């Protein structure tokens, strides 16, 4: 699918104690490329992958300044929301923000988004048209009236249609050899007995990128999806991902089951079996 640039902000109040902490991470597709964390002294926006390191000092200065000012805004925001909900000043709360753009075939914004959450729940979000907001509750409706009167949606739209996509197309170039390379998973099937009438067959997918993948089991061409164990896709540690799908079968029917792996890194979808 289409490439995307996205940022994820987490602000956490520390009462008090008596300030916040603010963390930002930036991704291109499933690859983290920058981070900011004012838990560190003299905080700076910093590179998290080789290909971004080549940005000049002015970029890093501008990004740093920008996020530090954003951190201040979220510090104030936490105080404001505590007020909206008439909550105790002694408790810590979270304000999360999620925004990004997707690149279309014409090199323009395919679609963009901006979503915010308070204490882990939807608070306010920009609608698909990038021109109106959806408030989750009465408190968010106060924020909404402020953002409507302030032209926040129009600034967001211009960013998403402008700087966001422009930056994305740039990063995609800089990190060509890695961002635009599909890394197929290395696969195999393992067997793990249990009692006499149970045997776990596990289909592995290792070191793949991007994150999107399909692992399914079939019993003579019939899907076995409902008794299948599917783990959450997990980071390999090197920028790639891992995943596996297991299912218990009769200790003799091993040959009667097939694992099917679909990943854009493959030439053809795979069909694995236990040997």
């Amino acid at each position: 699918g289409p490439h995307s640039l996205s940022y994820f902000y987490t602000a956490v109040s520390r009462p008090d104690r008596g300030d916040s902490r603010f963390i930002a991470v930036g991704y291109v597709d499933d690859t983290q490329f920058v981070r900011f964390d004012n838990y560190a002294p003299n905080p700076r926006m910093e590179p998290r992958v080789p290909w971004i390191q080549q940005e000049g000092q002015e970029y890093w200065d501008r990004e740093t300044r920008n996020v530090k000012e954003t951190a201040q805004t979220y510090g104030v925001g936490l105080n404001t929301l505590r007020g909206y909900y008439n909550q105790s000043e002694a408790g810590s709360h979270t304000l999360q923000s999620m925004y990004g753009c997707y690149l279309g075939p014409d090199g323009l914004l395919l679609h963009g988004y901006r979503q915010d959450a308070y204490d882990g729940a939807d608070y306010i979000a920009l609608n698909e048209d990038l021109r109106s907001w959806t408030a989750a509750d009465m408190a968010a409706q106060i924020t909404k009236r402020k953002w409507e009167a302030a032209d926040e949606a129009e600034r967001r739209r211009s960013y998403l249609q402008g700087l966001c996509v422009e930056s994305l197309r740039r990063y995609l170039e800089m990190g060509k050899d890695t961002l635009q390379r599909a890394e197929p998973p290395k696969t195999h099937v393992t067997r793990h007995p249990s009692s006499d009438l149970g045997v776990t067959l596990r289909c592995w997918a290792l070191g793949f990128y991007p994150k999107e993948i399909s692992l399914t089991w079939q019993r003579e061409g019939q899907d076995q999806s409902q008794d299948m164990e599917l783990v959450e896709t997990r980071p390999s540690g090197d920028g790639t991902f891992q995943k596996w799908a297991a299912l218990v079968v009769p200790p003799g029917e091993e040959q009667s089951y097939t694992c099917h792996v679909q990943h854009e890194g493959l030439q053809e979808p795979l069909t694995l079996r236990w040997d």
Binding site: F8, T10, V12, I23, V25, Q32, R35, D37, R48, S92, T94, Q96, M98, A117, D119, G120, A121, D122, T190, H192, R202, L206, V231, E232, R234, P235, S236, G237, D238, Q242, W244
Partner: protein, 99 residues
């Protein structure tokens, strides 16, 4: 105000093999609030390990990766210990080269 417990996976980067250097991973996700303590243990003792930058999934729940280099053998026991407000007591997940 709503707390979600951490899910934990402990695993190696490459297929385990005694004597061969590898990488030990403890992936923790689905939790909230963000405050959490995650330690990789070797025979019950804390290891040097680095932690990823705090991020979150589409459902707002946080995830972190704690990981370190290690050379698996036939003796050493590895595990991940996780402390979170949602947890009655520390969550200890022993490493299994089969899962």
């Amino acid at each position: 105000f709503v707390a979600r417990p951490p899910k934990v996976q402990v695993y190696s980067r490459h297929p385990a093999e005694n004597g061969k250097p590898n990488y030990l991973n403890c992936y923790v996700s689905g939790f909230h609030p963000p405050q959490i303590e995650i330690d990789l243990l070797k025979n019950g003792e804390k290891m040097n390990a680095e932690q990823s930058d705090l991020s979150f999934s589409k459902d707002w729940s946080f995830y972190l990766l704690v990981h370190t280099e290690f050379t698996p053998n036939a003796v050493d026991q590895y595990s991940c210990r996780v402390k979170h407000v949602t947890l009655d007591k520390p969550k200890i997940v022993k490493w299994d080269r089969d899962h």
